[PDB]
Ligand SMILES: Nc1nc2c(ncn2[C@@H]2O[C@H](COP(=O)(O)OP(=O)(O)NP(=O)(O)O)[C@@H](O)[C@H]2O)c(=O)[nH]1
């Protein structure tokens with residue numbers, strides 16, 4: 001009924017927007033999707049039969065299944081994609097809904113590889129983003145959300161087809177206000193920046209990410225995505241470290257990253273992204289690692305670690321930020337006195353992950369009358385039991401030679417405190433050094449660092465007869 | 477959907493891998509087939525041995541600029557095909573170099589299969605059908621079957637006898 005089916009579809013198009021009749025429509029013996037597909041197969045070449053019908057699948061695909069959705073890629077997607085994109089490569093409403101329904105069914109992982117196959121190629125999206133809408137907001141928003149959804153482990157198709165790693169960038173710089181566009185685009189670009197820089201262009205991400213950092217200030221998701229994309233840009237193209245800064249002609253992006261860290265304090269994800277962002281900021285600058293120190297950001301990141309104490313990722317990132325922050329900073333005794341037991345709390349809260357102790361060990365080194373101050377400092381320090389933490393850490397990780405060097409350096413530093421041969425002998429340390437010495441004999445740096453410790457932890461208890469045979473063999 | 481397979485297809489430029497790929501899945505031939513610009517899927521699910529087995533064909537490029545890009549897939553490739561031409565012994569005389577790209581990255585269960593392309597005019601071939609059998613002197617994985625994507629000759633038994641032996645290598 002080529003004139004009575006169209007009005008039936010029009011009734012459907014007005015009916016579906018009410019909602020909750022929708023589940024009743026699905027709960028039927030109609031196979032309503034098969035009805036619509038048989039209709040569209042019956043009536044090609046018709047704006048009303050095509051457009052109203054796609055507007056329907058547009059809202060109808062939101063609640064079907066996961067498996068019938070996974071089933072539908074047999075030949076159903078074929079009807080929608082083919083007819084609409086090809087038959088109607090200039091009908092803006094149709095391609096908008098075609099990208100929308102494709103994005104909706106692009107959810108299950110077993111469908112994405114079908115969508116990125118050779119027969120079904122999801123680069124019609126590019127043809128749409130170029131031709132059908134050079135100046136339409138809704139099409140660009142939906143297409144870029146689709147392209148972010150497509151980024152599974154097959155990155156070297158999307159990036160190698162250079163009509164994706166470029167067109168998304170023009171989409172970002174075109175519309176700087178659509179928030180969904182931002183949280184799709186910058187996430188996609190952070191996931192593709194490594195592979196696109198495995199092959200100026202680096203100027204493109206930076207200004208867009210800076211304006212996105214400033215403008216959509218109140219939102220969390222846009223700034224998690226922004227700090228992520230900026231971090232993953234600068235950590236792969238070092239040449240534009242100089243292109244930012246508080247100086248004229250530059251972007252004071254470090255101020256914005258600090259502010260974004262301060263704002264959405266309750267969310268661990270944005271603090272994680274901002275901490276990695278500030279880390280890679282400080283990693284290739286020396287002016288930055290005095291201002292934030294003067295800006296008191298260390299106490300704030302200590303507070304944030306005190307808040308998200310039950311989460312190891314932000315603990316890793318906070319210790320890492322402290323690492324790059326204190327990288328070459330003179331300090332008063334009150335600083336390290338207040339600081340250290342917080343960090344040991346951070347470690348004994350996450351006493352299981354190598355990286356959360358890798359970066360923390362890499363940071364804690366920097367801190368190690370005024371003598372009375374040092375006396376109470378080290379006494380409360382062993383009260384916070386540094387020595388048990390680090391020695392059991394090396395006990396926990398026969399591997400990870402970085403901490404197997406640095407924590408040894410820490411202990412050799414700490415042994416100049418009067419409790420050492422009391423408390424390293426009220427806890428025991430030397431056998432771990434011996435087990436690591438035989439674990440790492442060939443490493444010259446680990447050998448020489450641990451050898452002075454061997455000379456600093458042998459008392460009459462440890463050199464009691466019989467117990468020195470292993471020490472003799474390992475020394476010779 | 478029982479298992480998904482990870483066959484790779486490598487070979488020289490313009491030999492016909494992209495030709496031989498779609499002749500097995502889309503069954504379409506075209507003399508004006510554009511050379512592939514990187515790696516590319518081609519999904520296919522075939523039911524065999526009481527199991528609906530999925531298949532991922534990864535057509536690589538072959539050009540020198542795209543040598544490093546394709547390299548990330550051999551360490552995850554289950555089966556490995558090598559395709560080579562017949563007019564061009566130079567497309568044959570780099571098979572150890574292809575093997576150099578194989579041996580540096582292939583896994584333990586890589587069952588090689590050689591295939592001469594375009595068998596329609598083998599009398600004018602620069603390479604004999606026995607030269608590949610003379611090239612078959614490699615390890616026990618290496619097999620051989622001359623074929624043709626134009627004549628659609630034995631294109632299934634290229635993949636089928638491979639994936640049968642692959643599933644035979646499977647427990
Ligand atoms: N006569 C004949 N010609 C063939 C056959 N297979 C391929 N060709 C020719 O070889 C050309 C090369 O096509 P193609 O599949 O891209 O070769 P390729 O080495 O896989 N190139 P790429 O991997 O870069 O896509 C085809 O266009 C076709 O003219 C065949 O079986 N017979």
Ligand SMILES: [Mg+2]
Pocket residue numbers: 490491492493494495509510511512
């Ligand atoms: Mg080809």
